[PDB]
């Protein structure tokens, strides 16, 4: 009865193809020449860095590097609030609690580590050691102060409970390494990447994937939710950013350019959802328009590749940081 | 410029000083990563040293050089994604033994990459007594084309070593080799010699004058 699957697939193909009919709102003015400049130089790290996150105060950002140290900077005055020494040196992700009391990170150790900030003794320490996965971790997010959502290399995504310390549920079905899981603003749905050019939305309560989007040719590496909580964009090693809408169930705007031949490492939207930031595996940070489909924004520096970039909740500034151990704040 | 952020800033400077001290202390050692393929490989080497489902790091001590050895053995996930972080590592270790010789092309695959190129490879042939006792008997075969060589023994071993090599398409690579019988303690010494040699080569390449 496997042929029924490939006939149903043609059915849904015709369905999506018919539900759509580029040539709309093209008359709007272009964003124009957009240029950002460096305002701060966060130069505390020693080795390559991978990920960073913004707190809800839009003041403190935490980044992780191969040296195994987490730094809570003061973006205003370039100070160092805390320096956490890690147990496992190899890390690929970090996360900041919405309440600002906890910080979490994980990597090749296959265990998510959660830290505490506010304490009587005035020193940071571990809280829980989540150990359910058998593969390398990719990213962690906080649904709230009590629940964490993570995505490992076992083609599986699991939701935990810090106080319980056990996997309350597990999501699976991607049949490939899942990377860069980003929560939605509604904090009730999310979409995760995969190694087979596939993206799936998931339900935080029911426990099964709702939709499965396709259409890309190679591995994808980044994904993030739109501010409206009704769309998302995905980056991939094919130097292409593709925008998908759950309502449309089809790709909307394929950003491309002949000159660029590289990959993609991280993406993030803007406060109003008009600037589509991205970080390439090159010596720049390419910036694209929301739906006008033009390679407008370009950012020079720094020397090495680019790994991560994250926009603040309020949009006052943007942050960057990569393998050269330097972090720049562009305003 | 205000009372208390003056204290905050001096705290920040103390943190920076402590961080720099820790970094200069930590970067002093040397790092070798071994990713033996297949089976019957790296187990003997890791056993020759004198909470699961994760990479295991082994720390060594030899002539005031303690070594940090990482083996991604339990990683069931794809190599391309987590393989890259090891970029700034002095030497790699390669173990093979003794058909099912896809390790031959795997060696070529790891030796040729868009990054990671300028690194020497220390490959081991840890099963030598087994091969010898297999070659006194005539399997023979050899299931290779145009071998056209003497059956036993050093001739066949040298032909094998010529194979599985010569795929270095770049200069300034110093591929090493050894004949391990899974019963000798010389592995640490030859590893140390290879490390010392690559450090000297590196230093010479640095102005350089190379």
């Amino acid at each position, epitope marked *: 009865l496997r042929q029924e699957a490939e006939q149903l697939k043609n059915q849904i193909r015709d369905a999506r193809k018919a539900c759509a009919d580029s040539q709309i709102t093209n008359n709007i003015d272009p964003v124009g020449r957009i240029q950002m400049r460096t305002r701060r130089t966060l130069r505390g790290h020693l080795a390559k860095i991978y990920a960073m996150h913004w707190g809800t105060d839009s003041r403190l950002l935490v980044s992780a590097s191969q040296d195994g140290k987490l730094i809570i900077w*003061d973006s205003y005055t370039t100070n160092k*609030v805390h320096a956490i020494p890690l147990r496992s040196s190899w890390v690929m992700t970090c996360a900041y609690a919405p309440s600002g009391n906890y910080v979490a990170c994980g990597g090749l150790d296959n265990i998510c580590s959660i830290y505490n900030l506010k304490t*009587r003794e*005035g*020193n940071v320490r571990v809280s829980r050691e989540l150990a359910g996965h058998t593969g390398y971790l990719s990213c962690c997010r906080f649904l709230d102060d009590n629940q964490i959502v993570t995505s490992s290399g076992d083609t599986t995504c699991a939701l935990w409970d810090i106080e319980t310390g056990q996997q309350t549920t597990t999501f699976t079905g991607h049949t490939g390494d899942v990377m860069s899981l980003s929560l939605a603003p509604d904090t009730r749905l999310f979409v995760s990447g995969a190694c087979d050019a596939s993206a799936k939305l998931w339900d935080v309560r029911e426990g099964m994937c709702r939709q499965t989007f396709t259409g890309h040719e190679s591995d994808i590496n980044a994904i993030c939710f739109f501010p409206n909580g009704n769309a998302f964009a995905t980056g991939s090693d094919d130097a292409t950013c593709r925008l998908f809408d759950l309502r449309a169930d089809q790709e909307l705007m394929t950003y491309s350019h002949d000159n660029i031949i590289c990959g993609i490492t991280s993406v993030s939207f803007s406060k109003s959802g008009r600037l589509l930031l991205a970080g390439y595996d090159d010596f720049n940070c390419n910036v694209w328009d929301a739906l006008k489909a033009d390679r407008a924004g370009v950012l020079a520096g720094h020397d090495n590749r680019v790994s991560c970039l994250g926009v603040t909740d309020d949009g006052m500034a943007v942050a960057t940081g990569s393998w050269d151990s330097f972090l720049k704040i562009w305003n | 410029l*205000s*009372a208390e952020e003056r*204290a905050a800033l001096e705290r920040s400077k103390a943190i920076e000083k402590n961080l720099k001290e820790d970094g200069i202390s930590a970067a002093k050692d040397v790092k070798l990563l071994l990713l033996g393929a297949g089976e019957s490989g790296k187990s003997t080497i890791v056993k020759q040293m004198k909470k699961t489902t994760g990479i295991v790091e082994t720390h060594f001590t030899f002539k005031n050089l303690h070594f940090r050895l990482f083996d991604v053995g339990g990683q069931r996930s794809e190599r391309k994604k987590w393989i890259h972080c090891f970029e700034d590592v002095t030497a790699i270790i390669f173990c093979v033994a003794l058909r099912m010789h896809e390790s031959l092309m795997l060696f070529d695959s790891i030796c040729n990459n868009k990054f990671f190129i300028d690194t020497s490879i220390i490959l081991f042939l840890n099963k030598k007594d087994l091969f010898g006792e297999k070659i006194k008997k005539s399997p023979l075969t050899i299931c290779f084309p145009e071998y056209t060589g003497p059956n036993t023994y050093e001739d066949a071993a040298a032909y094998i070593q010529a194979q599985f090599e010569s795929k270095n398409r770049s200069p300034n690579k110093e591929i090493y080799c050894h004949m391990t019988c899974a019963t000798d303690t010389n592995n640490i010494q030859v590893v140390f010699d290879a490390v010392t040699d690559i450090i000297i080569a590196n230093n010479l390449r640095g102005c350089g004058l190379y």
Partner: single-chain antibody
Amino acid sequence: DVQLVESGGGLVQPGGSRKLSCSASGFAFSSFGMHWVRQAPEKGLEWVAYISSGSGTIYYADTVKGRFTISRDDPKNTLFLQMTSLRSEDTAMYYCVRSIYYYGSSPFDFWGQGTTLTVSSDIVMTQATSSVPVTPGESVSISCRSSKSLLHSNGNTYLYWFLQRPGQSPQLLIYRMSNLASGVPDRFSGSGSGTAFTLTISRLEAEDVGVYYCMQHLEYPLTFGAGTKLELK
């Protein structure tokens, strides 16, 4: 939890010598800046001296220079303060207070027990009156008159409040005159303007009666207000 035990005081003849030791436990003492505060046996508060967490910065009060010295040793978790050439005015009981300074910090959070000691410009704030009759279940208002505006360019208001239980060590109520300290009921709420400072207490109860104090941190040296005491008539 955190405990501060100090015992180094005693009746010393004027012109003699003595040393003070405040023992710290239950927290990372090595990463905290430490404070000395004395209280007169009848009334009044004042700042004695302060030592940085890294011990790279030292301060003393106006009438302390040349007579008293301070020093701390991290491995011993104790602070050393030397009383030299003590005067007849020095007869007062002391307090050793911990502090910490970074973004979003709450200094002077925990106070010690104190020692008994006997013998034989800068902005100043005043509180008046020092005694108001109150009733349970009724909100009260407290104000501390200040000399110079404390609103720094950083958008902050460097001022702190305190409450001393009758016969017990004082503890903090509001830090930076706008926030809430840990373990404090939400009824309390600091307020005030750049120069005028007001304290608000809603639903006062019979266990919150005591003496209030106002203290500024914009510039060294520190200073303390006259204070206000309540009653349950």
